[PDB]
């Protein structure tokens, strides 16, 4: 029947986002403070 047909173009989709990265900064920031605290305790 129909000859072999070409495929169409692709449309990718990035995952990470600026605001979600601000949220990841919220995640990361507290860790350093907690680290300062634990280092104090050990010292």
């Amino acid at each position: 029947g129909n000859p072999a047909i070409f495929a169409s173009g692709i449309i990718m989709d990035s995952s990470i986002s600026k605001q979600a990265l601000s949220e990841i900064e919220t995640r990361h920031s507290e860790i350093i403070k907690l680290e300062n605290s634990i280092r104090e305790l050990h010292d």
Partner: peptide, 22 residues
């Protein structure tokens, strides 16, 4: 207690982190 880090992208990296905290 059910977790410690929100899952924006999941991935193995988010697991060990949490476990360490535990």
């Amino acid at each position: 207690s059910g977790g410690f880090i929100r899952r924006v992208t999941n991935d193995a990296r988010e697991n060990e982190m949490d476990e360490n905290l535990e």
